[PDB]
């Protein structure tokens, strides 16, 4: 796909694993083998070897630079590069957008609506932050019932 070799069989990706441990191994040569800063570089090497063995096992595509490239078209092999964490993101981002929208409706029908935005009512906030879990069923539910959008006759419009 797109002229990119897989990273498990890429010679450039294995070259970057070789020259990263060798950079960290030469950093280890000036420390005692049981010393505290040498345990951090030894944990860095095992973090590096975990990283390169994770990138090759996920079917990542590596170019001529030896670097893993993401295919965001919507490929059946490449769902976890953009499509799977994008749907994970939009669920979380729609959770932020739904509990901030539902908080403003809950404080617009209050005695002092502007004091509830500088001082956020946490019992009112936390009872709808739980309610933002099921938000695609509540956003399209408000879209189908007409409560999501406001009619243009009740919207402040600058003159022509």
């Amino acid at each position: 796909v797109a002229g990119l070799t897989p990273c498990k069989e890429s010679k450039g990706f294995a070259k970057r694993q070789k020259q990263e441990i060798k950079k960290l191994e030469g950093r280890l040569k000036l420390y005692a083998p049981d010393s505290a800063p040498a345990l951090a570089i030894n944990a860095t090497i095992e973090k590096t070897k975990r990283r390169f063995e994770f990138y090759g096992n996920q079917g990542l595509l590596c170019g001529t630079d030896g670097l893993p490239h993401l295919i965001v078209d919507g490929d059946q092999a490449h769902l976890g590069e953009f499509v799977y964490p994008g749907l994970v993101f939009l669920y979380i981002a729609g959770w932020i957008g739904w509990v901030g929208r539902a908080y403003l409706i809950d404080v617009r029908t209050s005695k002092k609506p502007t004091e509830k935005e500088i001082i956020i009512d946490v019992p009112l906030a936390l009872r709808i932050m739980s309610k933002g879990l099921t938000w695609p069923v509540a956003a399209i539910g408000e879209l189908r019932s007409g409560k999501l959008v406001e009619k243009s006759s009740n919207i402040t419009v600058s003159p022509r």
Binding site: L133, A138, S145
Partner: protein, 203 residues
Amino acid sequence: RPLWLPGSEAPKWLDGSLPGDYGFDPLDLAAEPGRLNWMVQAELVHCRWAMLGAAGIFIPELLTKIGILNTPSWYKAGDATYFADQGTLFIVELLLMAWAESRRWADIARPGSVNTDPIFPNNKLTGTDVGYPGGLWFDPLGWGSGSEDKLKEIRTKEVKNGRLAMLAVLGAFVQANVTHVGPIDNLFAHLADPYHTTILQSL
């Protein structure tokens, strides 16, 4: 009536008429006027597809463990060959699902409209309530009619057996994803060492 949470106020929309009502709408997914008519029809197909799902996931796998059917596992049943192509059987299903669900779609939208036959109109369905198509094709024994207190109990028994099957089928799905073993063998591996075969050990 009993509720899902003692000391919690029941919502104003779930008033206790609906069979299976335990005041369980914490996230307010059926608040809106006219919305609880759609969410019962959604619950009824999902509960009946899950009881159809649980009878095809657990019962042929249990009888495979006894060994009187030798049926393959349900998560490997899509790889099994038949007299038809597996891709072909998808589209033949959704042409038949285009008929059966759109007749069901008009019943939710316009109740009392599609109880008559499209071909031979003397054959009419005897169901009166929305979501309960009584007739010779669906209720040949006539168990869907009687007193309203008697009818509420058997409608409560559909959804309580149905919500268990939904949880069941959702359980088999995640069990086959992280353990890759069929769910009757997951039960039999839990009656041997229960404290070592747990969701933390299977991650």
